[PDB]
A and B are shown apart, each in its own frame.
With several copies, the nearest count.
Chain A
Amino acid sequence: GSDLGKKLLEAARAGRDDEVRILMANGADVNAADVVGWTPLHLAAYWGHLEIVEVLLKNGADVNAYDTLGSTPLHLAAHFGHLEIVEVLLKNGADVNAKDDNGITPLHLAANRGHLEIVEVLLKYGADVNAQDKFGKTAFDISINNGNEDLAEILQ
């Protein structure tokens, strides 16, 4: 809504470090939100633009922020394979066992695609391997429908 949040949002998805830090210097709202509820954290995680995500939460950006449906930057980094950002958002206090309206955690989004590195990173930090979405699906049933044997071995 403000002229600083809009610039932050136009710059985060664009991948511009100097401009984002300059916007934050003049007092820009890091927890600004797009019309759908996506902050510069959401965009930096969706497009994998680190050097921005490390730069935002260093200035008080809410890592566990949720959009107008309940998704957090983890859901976006875990659904696309950004390990350098998953191991960072977790280090800065990101709820590994988050849940949106649909009940999907970053486990279901990392297993539906098969990012076993990130699945390891997430189970390292206490991701309930027996949680459920609203359909009654664990990461194990997802690994089985997709037919990935590696994940079947990971979850014992």
Chain B
Amino acid sequence: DIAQVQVQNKLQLAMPLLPQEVQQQGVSVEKSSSSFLMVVGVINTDGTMTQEDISDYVAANMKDAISRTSGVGDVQLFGSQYAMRIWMNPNELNKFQLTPVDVITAIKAQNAQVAAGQLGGTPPVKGQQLNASIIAQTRLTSTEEFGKIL
């Protein structure tokens, strides 16, 4: 424990030096044995479930609840979560005089959760009878909403 603490008191000096493409993917520091304690498989007896679909269910509904278990230091996933993988086409990007950076800016501008504020906030005025929370943008939550991105 104090070993992990000493190790991770030295990363706190290095993380500022790493690129924002690493910090944003998540750095990990963990006690662990080198061998697997146990492997837990998930299958669809009937069908209609691709590896992607079982991997997502596993990563979402059963992985974070096990890594919180006491004794478990590392949990590897034999698959991966879902993600709005956005496959692009250069022959349709030059046709419109675009580039990947212009797609990225649009995405991280239109998929956002904003600190809009608070109707009837604080400090208020004398004679206010309303209090409410403003809502401007949200995360697009689906596949058809990423298509309407301008």
Interface residues on B, range: under 10
The answer to whether A36 touches B130 (Cβ under 8 A) is yes
Interface residues of A in 30-58 (CB under 8 A from B): 35-36
Q: How many residues from A make CB contacts under 8 Å with B?
A: 5
CB under 8 Å from chain A, chain B span 109-149:
129-130, 132, 144, 147-148
Q: Is A145 located at the chain interface by the 8 A CB criterion?
A: yes
Measured between beta carbons, the chain B residues less than 8 angstroms from A35 are: 129-130
B147 touches A147 (CB 8 A): yes
CB distance from A146 to the nearest CB of B (A): 6
Q: Are A146 and B144 neighbours in the complex by a CB distance under 8 Å?
A: yes
Q: How far is the CB of A127 from chain B (nearest CB, A)?
A: 23
> Please, what's the 1-or-0 string for A135-156, where 1 marks a CB less than 8 Å from any CB in chain B?
0000000000111000000000
Q: Which residues of B contact A145 (CB under 8 A)?
A: 148
Which 7 A/B pairs are nearest by Cβ-Cβ distance? A145-B148, A35-B130, A35-B129, A147-B147, A146-B144, A147-B144, A146-B148
- A-side residues, CB < 8 A to B, are 35-36, 145-147
Residue contacts A-B, CB under 8 angstroms, 10 given = A35-B129, A35-B130, A36-B130, A36-B132, A145-B148, A146-B144, A146-B148, A147-B144, A147-B147, A147-B148
